[PDB]
Ligand binder design. Structure first.
Ligand SMILES: Nc1ncnc2c1ncn2[C@@H]1O[C@H](COP(=O)(O)OP(=O)(O)O)[C@@H](O)[C@H]1O
Ligand SMILES: Nc1ncnc2c1ncn2[C@@H]1O[C@H](COP(=O)(O)OP(=O)(O)O)[C@@H](O)[C@H]1O
Lengths: 134, 134
């Protein structure tokens, strides 16, 4: 109710709109909309208190995963990495269309607790590339 | 006799009131009280000489285990450890009820013969958590 209030948030059936409170981030999927396809939420809509844990479908990647929005203070090097390794993953057929040598090894050095593995996992999640840890 | 003397100690059947002397601490359990449930002790009560070793019940934890009363001179560090590890050990469900990171590793540095394992055992006995030694 606080979230929908003063908002008139548009919403389509199946959306995963997320709410935050009680220092926890819970996302509620709208399963059914009486009109279709989408609807505005109005304060005059009776509200429906069910609270059942329907398990998430396998195919979607949970919102639990990290992204570029979960890191701060390393914008310059983050942009460097993004521009360095954006083409070989989103455009490999290109790299087979041209004769050029891409990088095949990267080193990151800094004091511990600076967000290195976090950066690697964020980059992996944000391009769909398979991630392996050693 | 000297302990009940000048005392009128309140006493209920089954209590483990402890007596100390002869450079040893022995506790005598009252198994029978002629009136019930509790009573005061009086100098005019004849006394009974039995002195038989009935073995202690399994479920109760003996008085041999160390408590905070056995450690003095380290009040600050003991208070720090208590305030640090009271919640996770005695309120596990809460930490699942909120998103926060508890500590799962502690180091204690000091010269030998200062009572570090003593403190660990005292805390373990005072919170009822299982204790393992390596
Ligand atoms: N740049 C950053 N922005 C936000 N959080 C960070 C950053 N760097 C480290 N952290 C925090 O550090 C934790 C992970 O540490 P990590 O980076 O794995 O250590 P290491 O640097 O040894 O790999 C995360 O919980 C994260 O919140
Ligand atoms: N408050 C106290 N502080 C330090 N030592 C104590 C205290 N009370 C008793 N002791 C003594 O500490 C000894 C045990 O210390 P110990 O466990 O060997 O410490 P450490 O493991 O650090 O060497 C006992 O023999 C006991 O007499």
């Amino acid at each position: 109710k606080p979230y929908f209030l003063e908002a008139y948030r548009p919403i389509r059936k199946g959306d995963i709109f997320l709410v935050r409170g009680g220092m926890r981030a819970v996302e509620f999927k709208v399963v059914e909309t009486d009109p279709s396809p989408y609807c505005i939420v109005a304060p005059d809509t009776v509200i429906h208190c069910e609270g059942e844990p329907i398990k998430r479908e396998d195919e979607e990647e949970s919102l639990n995963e990290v992204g570029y929005d979960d890191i701060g203070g390393c914008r310059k090097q983050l942009a460097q990495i993004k521009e360095m390794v954006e083409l070989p993953l989103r455009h490999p057929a290109l790299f087979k269309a041209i004769g050029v040598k891409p990088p095949r090894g990267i080193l990151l050095y800094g004091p511990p607790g600076t967000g290195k593995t976090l950066i690697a996992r964020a980059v992996a999640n944000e391009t769909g590339a398979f991630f392996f840890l050693i």
